[PDB]
Amino acid sequence: NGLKMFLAALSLSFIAKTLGAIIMKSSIIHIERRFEISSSLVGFIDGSFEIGNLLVIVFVSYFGSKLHRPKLIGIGCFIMGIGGVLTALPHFFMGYYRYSKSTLSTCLISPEIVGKGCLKESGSYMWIYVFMGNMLRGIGETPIVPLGLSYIDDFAKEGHSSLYLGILNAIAMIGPIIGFTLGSLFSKMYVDIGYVDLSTIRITPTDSRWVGAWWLNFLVSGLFSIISSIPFFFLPQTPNVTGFFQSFKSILTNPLYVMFVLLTLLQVSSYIGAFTYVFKYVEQQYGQPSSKANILLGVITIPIFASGMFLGGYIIKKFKLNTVGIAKFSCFTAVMSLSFYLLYFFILCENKSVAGLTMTYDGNNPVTSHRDVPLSYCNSDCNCDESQWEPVCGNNGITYISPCLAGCKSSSGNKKPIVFYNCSCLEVTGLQNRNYSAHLGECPRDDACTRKFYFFVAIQVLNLFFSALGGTSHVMLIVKIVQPELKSLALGFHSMVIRALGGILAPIYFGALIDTTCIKWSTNNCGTRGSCRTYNSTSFSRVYLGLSSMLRVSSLVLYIILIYAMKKKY
């Protein structure tokens, strides 16, 4: 055995860290509904992990490179566990969830939550516990990648180093699996499960204001991190201050390293943003929210991604590759991924033709600007709230904003069918089997586009496999181009850059440039602002895919320069 024992312990810690991350990112809606926490504060609670990890991922990645790396990893996992337990803590202190607990809109002739929440948050509201409990995860997660991997790449064999990193990044996928299954098994248990008799709880997952046993999940994450930290306290050191600024200057002055950091920042920002908004893209362009984007995609994706990471490691090992070799392999990965992106632009469909946003409500003449579209002879008599968004589809295949705007005055209502009838707007032609009708929901797109949806899913799985075939190349190329005694600080600073400029900023400006294309903004009662109901299909696609491809092209260009400069140096 030997280093293999540390490898197993570090794999367990990877599982714990990924499970913690996903189980924090899966309980946002639950906690929010049981805490009188304005979404704005929920964003801050979620960013607690970042504000904790950033201030430390360097100060512990250099000072730890000299003092018994395994014990530091163990203290880190133990801190992560205590953080999870302290996150689940507030459930035993507060009271019961006693605060547990239409609009057909046919046409015819103050801060209350924050106010009560603020009152509830008059002092240090219980929410702070979660925030801090989450921040601890940061302070505990940081000595795993920088302080662990260095160890391996400094105590392994000459070529083995890579296969291990592949095995670690491929076992870390057992994290999201156990997280998803344990959440969807636990998000079905009422918040106060065991305390209250579950036969009286009226609220249901189908109904609103339902809260599950959220304290049990963070508790599980905590117990799992603690059980993963127990083994680390037994491995040995070696299995056989005006210095910090000095080393940091000598690692930033290194041209190859800063060039590679900028490159990986660009590329990883592009991926992260693409995978953050790919679901909204699939929904807005084709019209398949969860037809194939459902858990199925997850169970078919996880084995692919794991196989990608492991094959990347194995190919870096089996096929002996020098530093230039790893650079060329990563560049080939980037070329294949960018070719797939530049393929995506050929899989596109027509725009969602909805009355009032792209055409006049009559459906005859297209309108240029959706702002100030005049009402037609359909409804000028029908008092219709123009801000309401209730997509309905008639026999003509045209989507409408609201059944009121549809020109309808009747609906099944209590009866199960959603059909509407008698509406001047659907009356486009004559003697054409004009049995005016309308079903609830957006117009389902013709088979010609759902067929392209499968092309999209296929090339997306292929591009995720080809981008996971190189996900074990960044760390190796970083450890190889930095001086031998600075690997940990290199990995730490690189994780800082990747997380603080590709995990916090990339979704932000992607969301901004995407919201540049919104056509209908849910106006709010407190303000005209809100979420977006629909995006212009072709313009949203263009903006999103174009920004992603531009980032990828800048990345690939840097790769060329880097491989060049590197081949010049060596």
Ligand SMILES: C=CC1=C(C)/C(=C\c2[nH]c(Cc3[nH]c(/C=C4\NC(=O)C(C)=C4C=C)c(C)c3CCC(=O)O)c(CCC(=O)O)c2C)NC1=O
């Ligand atoms: C439909 C299938 C499905 C998927 C794919 C899923 C999660 C999922 N999303 C991503 C991409 C992936 N990767 C990152 C981030 C990073 N990646 C990095 O290597 C670094 C250093 C960062 C920075 C923090 C993000 C944010 C996402 C997309 C997350 C999401 O929006 O779901 C991965 C690959 C690992 C990863 O990149 O973290 C996984 C397992 N859940 C599902 O149900």
Ligand SMILES: *[C@@H]1O[C@H](CO)[C@@H](O[C@@H]2O[C@H](CO)[C@@H](O)[C@H](O)[C@H]2NC(C)=O)[C@H](O)[C@H]1NC(C)=O
């Ligand atoms: C829907 O609209 C039609 C037309 O206004 C309503 O009825 C009639 O149409 C047929 C054929 O022209 C005839 O019975 C009369 O000319 C119309 N008057 C009525 C009310 O009988 C029909 O009743 C409406 N049905 C609804 C309310 O869904």
Ligand SMILES: *[C@@H]1O[C@H](CO)[C@@H](O)[C@H](O)[C@H]1NC(C)=O
């Ligand atoms: C209208 O009549 C046609 C037959 O001409 C029938 O197929 C269709 O289901 C009817 N639709 C409505 C709205 O009743």
